Short mmCIF file of C-alpha atoms and ligand atoms in Angstrom, two decimals:
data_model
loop_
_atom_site.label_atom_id
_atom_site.label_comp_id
_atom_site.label_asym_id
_atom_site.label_seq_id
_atom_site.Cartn_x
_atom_site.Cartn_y
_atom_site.Cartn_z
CA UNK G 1 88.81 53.69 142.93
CA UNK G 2 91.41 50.79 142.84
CA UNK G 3 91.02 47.35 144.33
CA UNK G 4 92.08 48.16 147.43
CA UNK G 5 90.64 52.12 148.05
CA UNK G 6 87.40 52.50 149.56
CA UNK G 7 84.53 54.77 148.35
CA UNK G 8 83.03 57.26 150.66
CA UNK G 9 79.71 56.31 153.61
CA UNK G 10 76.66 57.69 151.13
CA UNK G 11 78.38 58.29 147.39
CA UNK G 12 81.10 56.33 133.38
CA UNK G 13 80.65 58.52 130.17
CA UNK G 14 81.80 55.47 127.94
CA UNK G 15 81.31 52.27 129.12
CA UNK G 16 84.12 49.68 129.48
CA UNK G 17 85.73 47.16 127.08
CA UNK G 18 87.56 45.13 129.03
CA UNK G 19 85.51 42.01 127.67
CA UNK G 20 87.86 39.92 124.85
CA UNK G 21 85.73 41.26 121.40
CA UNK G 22 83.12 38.41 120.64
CA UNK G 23 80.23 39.34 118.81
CA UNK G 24 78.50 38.77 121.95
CA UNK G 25 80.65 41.10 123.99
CA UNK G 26 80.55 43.56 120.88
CA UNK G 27 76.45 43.46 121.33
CA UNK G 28 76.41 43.57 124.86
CA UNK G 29 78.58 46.79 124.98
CA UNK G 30 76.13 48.43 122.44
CA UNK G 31 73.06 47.55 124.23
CA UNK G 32 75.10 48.94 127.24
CA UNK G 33 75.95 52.09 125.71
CA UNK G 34 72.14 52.65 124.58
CA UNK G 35 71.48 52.13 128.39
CA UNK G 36 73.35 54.50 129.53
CA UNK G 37 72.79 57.30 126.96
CA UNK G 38 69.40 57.10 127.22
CA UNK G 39 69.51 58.15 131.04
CA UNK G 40 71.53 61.39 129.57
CA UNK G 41 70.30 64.78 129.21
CA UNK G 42 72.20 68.36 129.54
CA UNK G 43 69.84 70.38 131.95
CA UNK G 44 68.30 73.67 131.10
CA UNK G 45 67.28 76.00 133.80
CA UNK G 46 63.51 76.61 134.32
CA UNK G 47 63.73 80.36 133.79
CA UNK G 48 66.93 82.95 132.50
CA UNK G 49 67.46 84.81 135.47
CA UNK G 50 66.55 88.66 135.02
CA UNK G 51 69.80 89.68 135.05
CA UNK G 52 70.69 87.52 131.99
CA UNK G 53 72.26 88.85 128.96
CA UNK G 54 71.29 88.55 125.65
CA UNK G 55 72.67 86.72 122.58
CA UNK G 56 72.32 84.54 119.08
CA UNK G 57 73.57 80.83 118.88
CA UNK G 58 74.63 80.61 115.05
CA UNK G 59 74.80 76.49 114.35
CA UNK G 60 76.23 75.99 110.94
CA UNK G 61 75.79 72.53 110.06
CA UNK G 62 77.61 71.45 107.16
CA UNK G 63 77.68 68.46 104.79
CA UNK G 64 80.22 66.22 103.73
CA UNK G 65 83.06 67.25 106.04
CA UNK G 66 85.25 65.49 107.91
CA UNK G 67 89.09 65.77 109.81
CA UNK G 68 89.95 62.73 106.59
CA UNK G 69 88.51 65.28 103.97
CA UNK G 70 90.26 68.03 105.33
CA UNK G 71 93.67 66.06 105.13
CA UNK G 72 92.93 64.71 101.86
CA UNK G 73 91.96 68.11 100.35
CA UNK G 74 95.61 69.65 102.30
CA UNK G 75 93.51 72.31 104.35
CA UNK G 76 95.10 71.48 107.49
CA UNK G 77 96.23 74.77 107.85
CA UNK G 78 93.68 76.97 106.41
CA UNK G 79 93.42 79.94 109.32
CA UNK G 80 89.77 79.34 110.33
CA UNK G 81 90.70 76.13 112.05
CA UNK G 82 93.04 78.89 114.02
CA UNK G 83 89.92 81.29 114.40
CA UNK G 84 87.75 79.24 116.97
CA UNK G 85 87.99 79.32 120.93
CA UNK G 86 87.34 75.62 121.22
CA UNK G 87 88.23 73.10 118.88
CA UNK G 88 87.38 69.47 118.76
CA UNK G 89 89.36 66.46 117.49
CA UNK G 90 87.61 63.60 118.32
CA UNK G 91 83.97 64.90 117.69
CA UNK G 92 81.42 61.54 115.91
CA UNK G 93 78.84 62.58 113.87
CA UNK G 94 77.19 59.45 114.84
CA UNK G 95 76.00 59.04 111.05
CA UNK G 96 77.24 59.42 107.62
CA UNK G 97 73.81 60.21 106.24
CA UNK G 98 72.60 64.48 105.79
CA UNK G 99 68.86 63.78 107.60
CA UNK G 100 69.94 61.35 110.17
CA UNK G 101 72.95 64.08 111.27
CA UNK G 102 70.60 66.76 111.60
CA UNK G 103 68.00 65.33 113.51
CA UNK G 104 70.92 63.65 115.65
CA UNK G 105 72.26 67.25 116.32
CA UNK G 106 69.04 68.91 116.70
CA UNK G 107 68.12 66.34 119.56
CA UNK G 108 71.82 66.94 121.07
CA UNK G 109 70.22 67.49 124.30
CA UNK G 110 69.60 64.16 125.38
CA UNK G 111 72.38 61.10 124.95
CA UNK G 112 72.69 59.25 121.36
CA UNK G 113 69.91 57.12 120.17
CA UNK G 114 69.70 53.97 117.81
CA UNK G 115 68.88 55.11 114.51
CA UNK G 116 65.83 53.73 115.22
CA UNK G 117 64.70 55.85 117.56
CA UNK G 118 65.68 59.03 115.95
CA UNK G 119 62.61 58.38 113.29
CA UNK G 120 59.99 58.14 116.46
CA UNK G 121 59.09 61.18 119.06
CA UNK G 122 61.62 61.72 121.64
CA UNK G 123 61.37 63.39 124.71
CA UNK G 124 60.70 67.28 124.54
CA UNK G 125 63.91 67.88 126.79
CA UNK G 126 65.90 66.73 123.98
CA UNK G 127 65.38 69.55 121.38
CA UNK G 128 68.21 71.62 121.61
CA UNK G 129 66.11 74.18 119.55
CA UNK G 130 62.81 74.09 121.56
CA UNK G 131 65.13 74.11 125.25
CA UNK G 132 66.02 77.52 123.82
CA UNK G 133 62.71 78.68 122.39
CA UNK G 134 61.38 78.16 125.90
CA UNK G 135 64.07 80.30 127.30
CA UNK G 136 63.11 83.21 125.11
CA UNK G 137 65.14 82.41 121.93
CA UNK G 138 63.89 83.08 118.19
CA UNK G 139 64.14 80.19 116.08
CA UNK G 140 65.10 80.40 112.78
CA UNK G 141 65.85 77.80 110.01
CA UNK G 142 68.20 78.59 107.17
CA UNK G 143 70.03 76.67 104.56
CA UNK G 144 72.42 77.43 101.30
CA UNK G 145 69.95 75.31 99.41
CA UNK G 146 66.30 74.22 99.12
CA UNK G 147 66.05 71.02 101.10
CA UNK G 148 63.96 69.22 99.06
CA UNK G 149 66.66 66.39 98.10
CA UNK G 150 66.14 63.63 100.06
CA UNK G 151 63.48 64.94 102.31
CA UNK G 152 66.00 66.85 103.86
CA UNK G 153 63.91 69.69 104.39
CA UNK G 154 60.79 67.46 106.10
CA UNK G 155 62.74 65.44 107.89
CA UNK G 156 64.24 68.70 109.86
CA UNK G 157 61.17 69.36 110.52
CA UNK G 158 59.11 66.25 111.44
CA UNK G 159 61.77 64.51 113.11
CA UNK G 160 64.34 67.22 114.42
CA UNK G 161 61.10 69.49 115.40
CA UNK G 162 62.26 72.47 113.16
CA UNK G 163 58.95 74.01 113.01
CA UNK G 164 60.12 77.11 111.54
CA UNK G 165 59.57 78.66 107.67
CA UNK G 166 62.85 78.44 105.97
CA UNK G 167 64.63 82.09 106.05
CA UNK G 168 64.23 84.20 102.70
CA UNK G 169 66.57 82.74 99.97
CA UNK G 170 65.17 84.83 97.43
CA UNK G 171 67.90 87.28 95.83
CA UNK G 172 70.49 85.41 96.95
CA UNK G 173 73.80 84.66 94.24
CA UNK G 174 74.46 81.01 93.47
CA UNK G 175 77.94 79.68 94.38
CA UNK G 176 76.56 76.58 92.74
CA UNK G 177 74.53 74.54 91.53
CA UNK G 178 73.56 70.94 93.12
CA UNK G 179 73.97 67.32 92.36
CA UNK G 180 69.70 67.57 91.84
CA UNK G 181 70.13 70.44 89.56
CA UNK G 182 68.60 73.50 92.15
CA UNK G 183 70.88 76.16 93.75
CA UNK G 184 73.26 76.30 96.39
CA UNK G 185 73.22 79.95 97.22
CA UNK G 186 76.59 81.25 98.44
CA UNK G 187 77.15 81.42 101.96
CA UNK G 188 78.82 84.62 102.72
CA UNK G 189 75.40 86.13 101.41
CA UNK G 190 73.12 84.10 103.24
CA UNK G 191 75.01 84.80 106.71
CA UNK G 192 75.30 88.49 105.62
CA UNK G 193 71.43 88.43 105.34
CA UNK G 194 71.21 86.59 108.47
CA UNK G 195 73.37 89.39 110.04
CA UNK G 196 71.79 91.89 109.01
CA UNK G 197 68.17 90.47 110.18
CA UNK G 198 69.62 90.04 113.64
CA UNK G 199 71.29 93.06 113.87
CA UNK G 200 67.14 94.53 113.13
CA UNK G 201 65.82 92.77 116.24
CA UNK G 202 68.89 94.84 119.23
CA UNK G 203 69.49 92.87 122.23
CA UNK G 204 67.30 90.05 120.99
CA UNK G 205 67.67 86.30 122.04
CA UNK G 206 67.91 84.13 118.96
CA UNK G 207 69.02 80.36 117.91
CA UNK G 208 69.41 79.79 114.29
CA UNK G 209 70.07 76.27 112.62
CA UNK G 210 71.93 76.46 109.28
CA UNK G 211 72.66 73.92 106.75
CA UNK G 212 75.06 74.04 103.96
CA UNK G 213 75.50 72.01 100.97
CA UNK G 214 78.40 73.09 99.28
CA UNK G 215 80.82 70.22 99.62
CA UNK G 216 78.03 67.72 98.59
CA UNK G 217 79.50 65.29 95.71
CA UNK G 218 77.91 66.42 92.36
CA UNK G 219 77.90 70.06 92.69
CA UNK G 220 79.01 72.23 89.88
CA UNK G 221 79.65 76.04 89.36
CA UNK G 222 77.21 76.93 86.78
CA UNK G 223 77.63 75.88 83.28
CA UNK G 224 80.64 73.95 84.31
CA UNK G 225 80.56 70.29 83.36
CA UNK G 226 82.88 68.98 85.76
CA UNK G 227 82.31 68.42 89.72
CA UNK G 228 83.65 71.39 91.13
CA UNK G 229 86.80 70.14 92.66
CA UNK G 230 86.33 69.40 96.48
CA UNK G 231 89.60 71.22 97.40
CA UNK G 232 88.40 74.19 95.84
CA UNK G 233 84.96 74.26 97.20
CA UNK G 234 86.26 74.07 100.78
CA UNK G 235 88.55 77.07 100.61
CA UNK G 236 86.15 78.92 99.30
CA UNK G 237 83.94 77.48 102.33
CA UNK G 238 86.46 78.18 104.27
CA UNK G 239 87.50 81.75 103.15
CA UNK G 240 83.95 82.68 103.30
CA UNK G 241 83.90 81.69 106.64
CA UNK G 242 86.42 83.46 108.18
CA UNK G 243 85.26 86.61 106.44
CA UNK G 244 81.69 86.18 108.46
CA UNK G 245 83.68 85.46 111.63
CA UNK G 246 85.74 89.17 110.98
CA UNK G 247 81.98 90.53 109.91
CA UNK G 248 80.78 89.43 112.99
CA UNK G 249 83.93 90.61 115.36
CA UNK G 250 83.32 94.17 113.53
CA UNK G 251 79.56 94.08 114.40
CA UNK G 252 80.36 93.97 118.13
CA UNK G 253 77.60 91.61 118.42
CA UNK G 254 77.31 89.06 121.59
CA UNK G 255 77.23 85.49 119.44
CA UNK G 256 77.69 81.99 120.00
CA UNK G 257 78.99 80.22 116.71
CA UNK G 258 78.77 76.49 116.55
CA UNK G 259 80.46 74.50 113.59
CA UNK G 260 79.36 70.95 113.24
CA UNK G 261 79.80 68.99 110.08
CA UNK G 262 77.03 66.17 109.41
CA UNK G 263 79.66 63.91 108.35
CA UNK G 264 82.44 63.39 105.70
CA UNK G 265 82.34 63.50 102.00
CA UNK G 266 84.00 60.07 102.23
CA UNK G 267 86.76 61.93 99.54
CA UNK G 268 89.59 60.03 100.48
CA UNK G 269 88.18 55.88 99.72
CA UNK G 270 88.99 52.75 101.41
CA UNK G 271 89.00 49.00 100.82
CA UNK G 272 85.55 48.86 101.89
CA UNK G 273 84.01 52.15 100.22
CA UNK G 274 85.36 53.40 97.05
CA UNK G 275 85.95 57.61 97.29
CA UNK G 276 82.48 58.91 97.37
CA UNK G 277 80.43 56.22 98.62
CA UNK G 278 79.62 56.63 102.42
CA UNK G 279 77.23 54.14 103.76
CA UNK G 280 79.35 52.24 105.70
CA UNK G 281 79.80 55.25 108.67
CA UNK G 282 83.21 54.76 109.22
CA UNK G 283 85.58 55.97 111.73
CA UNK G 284 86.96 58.29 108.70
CA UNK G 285 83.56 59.39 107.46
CA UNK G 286 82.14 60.28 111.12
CA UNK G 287 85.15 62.30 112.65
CA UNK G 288 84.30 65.76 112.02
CA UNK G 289 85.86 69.10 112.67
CA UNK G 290 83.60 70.65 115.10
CA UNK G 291 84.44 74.19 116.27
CA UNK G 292 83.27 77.25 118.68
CA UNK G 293 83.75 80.75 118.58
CA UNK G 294 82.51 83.54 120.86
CA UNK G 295 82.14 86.64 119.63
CA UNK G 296 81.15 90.20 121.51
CA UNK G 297 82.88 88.79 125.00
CA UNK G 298 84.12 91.46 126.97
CA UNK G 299 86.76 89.39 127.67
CA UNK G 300 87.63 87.21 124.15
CA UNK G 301 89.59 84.03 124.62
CA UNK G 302 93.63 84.39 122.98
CA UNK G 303 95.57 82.58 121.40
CA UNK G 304 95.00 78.59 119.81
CA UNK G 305 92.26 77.42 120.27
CA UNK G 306 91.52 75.31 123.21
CA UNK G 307 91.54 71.48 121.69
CA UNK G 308 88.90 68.75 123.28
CA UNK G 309 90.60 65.85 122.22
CA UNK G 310 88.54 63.20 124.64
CA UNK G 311 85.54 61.41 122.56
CA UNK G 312 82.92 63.91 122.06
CA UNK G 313 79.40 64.18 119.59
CA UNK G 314 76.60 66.62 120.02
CA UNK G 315 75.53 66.29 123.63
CA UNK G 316 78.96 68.49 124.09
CA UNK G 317 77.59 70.97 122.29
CA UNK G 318 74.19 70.87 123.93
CA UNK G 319 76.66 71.47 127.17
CA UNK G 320 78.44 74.50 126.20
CA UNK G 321 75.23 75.65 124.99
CA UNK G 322 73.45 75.53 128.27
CA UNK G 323 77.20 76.86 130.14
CA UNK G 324 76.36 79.96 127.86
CA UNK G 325 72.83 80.48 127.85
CA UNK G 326 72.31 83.26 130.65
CA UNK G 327 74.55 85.28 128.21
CA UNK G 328 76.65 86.10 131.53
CA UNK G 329 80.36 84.57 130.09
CA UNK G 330 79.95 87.67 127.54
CA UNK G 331 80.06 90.13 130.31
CA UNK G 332 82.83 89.33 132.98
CA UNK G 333 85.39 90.77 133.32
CA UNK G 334 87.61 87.15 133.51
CA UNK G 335 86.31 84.53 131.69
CA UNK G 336 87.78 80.58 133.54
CA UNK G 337 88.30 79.47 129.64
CA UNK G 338 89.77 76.01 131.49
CA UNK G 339 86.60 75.63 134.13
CA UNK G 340 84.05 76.54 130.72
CA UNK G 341 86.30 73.61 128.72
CA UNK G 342 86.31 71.22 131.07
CA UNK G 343 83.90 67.89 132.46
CA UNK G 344 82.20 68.22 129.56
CA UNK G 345 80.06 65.03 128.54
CA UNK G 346 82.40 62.32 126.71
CA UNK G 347 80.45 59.88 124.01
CA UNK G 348 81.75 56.84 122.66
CA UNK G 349 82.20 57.05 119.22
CA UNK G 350 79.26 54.55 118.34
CA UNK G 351 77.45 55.41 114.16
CA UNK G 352 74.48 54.44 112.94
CA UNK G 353 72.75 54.35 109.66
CA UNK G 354 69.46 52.40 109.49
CA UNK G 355 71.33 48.88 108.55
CA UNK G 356 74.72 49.34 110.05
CA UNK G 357 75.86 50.08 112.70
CA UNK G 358 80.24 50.89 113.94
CA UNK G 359 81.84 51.02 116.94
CA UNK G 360 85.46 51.39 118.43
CA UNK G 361 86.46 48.11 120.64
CA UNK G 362 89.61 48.25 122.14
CA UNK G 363 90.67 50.69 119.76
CA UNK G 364 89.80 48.48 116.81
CA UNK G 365 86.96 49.65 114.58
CA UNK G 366 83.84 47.01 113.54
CA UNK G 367 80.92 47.04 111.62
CA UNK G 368 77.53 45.45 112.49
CA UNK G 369 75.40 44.73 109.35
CA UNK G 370 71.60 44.69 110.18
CA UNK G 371 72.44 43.10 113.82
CA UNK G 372 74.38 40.04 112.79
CA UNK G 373 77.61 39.48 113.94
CA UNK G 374 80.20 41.97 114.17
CA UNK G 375 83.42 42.16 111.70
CA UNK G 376 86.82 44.10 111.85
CA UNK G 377 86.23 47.30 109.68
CA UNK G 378 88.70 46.77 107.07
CA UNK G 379 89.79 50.10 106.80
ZN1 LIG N 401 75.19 65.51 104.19
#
């Protein structure tokens, strides 16, 4: 409403900069934005009505990826970014660190926390996992790897709430073998053997989280001294991708498919962080290609995919989530593709690790090093 309209007798996503950027203007807006994320949550209904239909959320969570790697490795226009219905461009991770991301999108539910807070109990409401396990949904935890680097594994679980044993892995080819020396099982198999598991259970309800490591730095095919090159590792990602999302058209199966990277691979460096090194979160690092893709609809969404290009992270995808969770888009006739794409939650693009923390300030990035004062990112 301008100066001069009036509101209504009776009646932000990202709150304003208009302040010149101080550091104590840069503070205040951060404290301002915790404020006002905290009072955030995406709403779940009590009960699925009984005429609800069935269907599996696939989350495929995947390290090292971001919109900067994808330029730098020249996969712009590999066809899965073509494949999805929805397609964001201006999705934050929030993070440039594996355990932080997960928890971060496994609590997507509420608004974005301090880093702080992610490593304490949160609210039960915020568990996008457990919202869904209420309503009915199997839970099931897979990864392309072991978890045990870096506590990934227990921190899913203690933190993100993951209570759920990790999915068979035994049988399962290597694609490659890790930076710590243990497998990273190829992915194609592992989402074949999820497929094939879901496809046992009929018009089940289930909600799997999946992690994949392949574009970690370090990783190797086996008996290969080099680093595999990243390029190559994300085309085969990539190709192995799109050859699930054909699997799963052919299985006529009703499923939601969520892509979410963690955060980048940092593969193209800057002044501040040499290629590889990531733990400044940077604009570059955090700005990940997030995608969704609805399979089984009776009526399928055509053509490009629809592009959210407002500033987005996961409480988005906790939105479209709960927009799909009576199963009911998958059976009309019509589906309002414009209506399901639209007034969903925008998030500034704020990242955290545990000592730094960067924001966007009238369109500027800065970093915040253990809460002194703020600096110009040097990008
Ligand atoms: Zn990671």
């Amino acid at each position: 409403i301008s100066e001069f309209g009036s509101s209504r007798a009776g009646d932000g996503d990202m709150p304003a900069q208009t302040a010149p950027p101080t550091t104590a203007n840069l503070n205040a807006w951060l404290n301002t934005f915790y404020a006002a994320e905290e009072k955030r949550k995406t709403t779940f209904p009590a009960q699925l009505p009984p005429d609800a239909q069935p269907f599996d959320l696939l989350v495929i969570n995947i390290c090292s990826l971001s919109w900067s790697d994808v330029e730098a490795a020249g996969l712009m226009s590999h066809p899965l970014w073509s494949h999805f219905d929805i397609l964001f461009k201006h999705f934050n991770s929030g993070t440039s660190y594996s355990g932080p991301a997960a928890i971060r999108l496994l609590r997507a539910s509420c608004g974005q926390p301090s880093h702080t807070r992610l490593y304490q109990p949160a609210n039960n409401e915020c568990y996008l996992f457990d919202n869904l396990a209420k309503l009915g949904f199997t839970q099931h935890l897979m990864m392309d790897h072991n978890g045990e680097f870096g506590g990934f594994l227990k921190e899913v679980r203690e933190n993100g709430g993951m209570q759920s044993e990790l999915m068979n892995q035994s049988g399962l080819p290597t694609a490659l073998l890790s930076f710590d020396g243990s497998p990273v099982y190829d992915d194609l198999a592992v989402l074949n053997r999820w497929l094939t598991g879901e496809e046992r259970e009929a018009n089940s309800r289930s909600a799997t989280f999946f992690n994949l490591l392949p574009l970690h730095d370090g990783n190797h095919f086996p008996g290969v001294s080099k680093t595999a090159d990243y390029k190559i590792r994300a085309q085969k990602l990539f190709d192995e991708l799109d050859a699930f999302f054909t699997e799963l058209e052919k299985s006529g199966r009703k499923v939601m498919v969520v892509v979410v990277p963690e955060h980048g691979g940092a593969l193209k460096g800057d002044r501040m962080q040499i290629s590889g090194l990531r733990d400044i979160p940077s604009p570059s690092i955090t700005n990940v290609p997030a995608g969704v893709k609805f399979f089984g609809m009776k009526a399928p969404h055509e053509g490009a995919p629809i592009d959210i290009n407002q500033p987005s992270s996961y409480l988005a995808i906790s939105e479209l989530v709960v927009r799909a969770v009576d199963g009911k888009l998958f059976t009309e006739d019509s589906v309002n593709w414009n209506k399901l794409t639209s007034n969903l939650p925008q998030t500034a693009p704020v990242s955290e690790n545990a000592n730094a923390v960067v924001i966007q300030y009238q369109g500027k990035p800065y970093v915040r090093l253990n809460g002194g004062d703020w600096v110009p990112y040097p990008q």
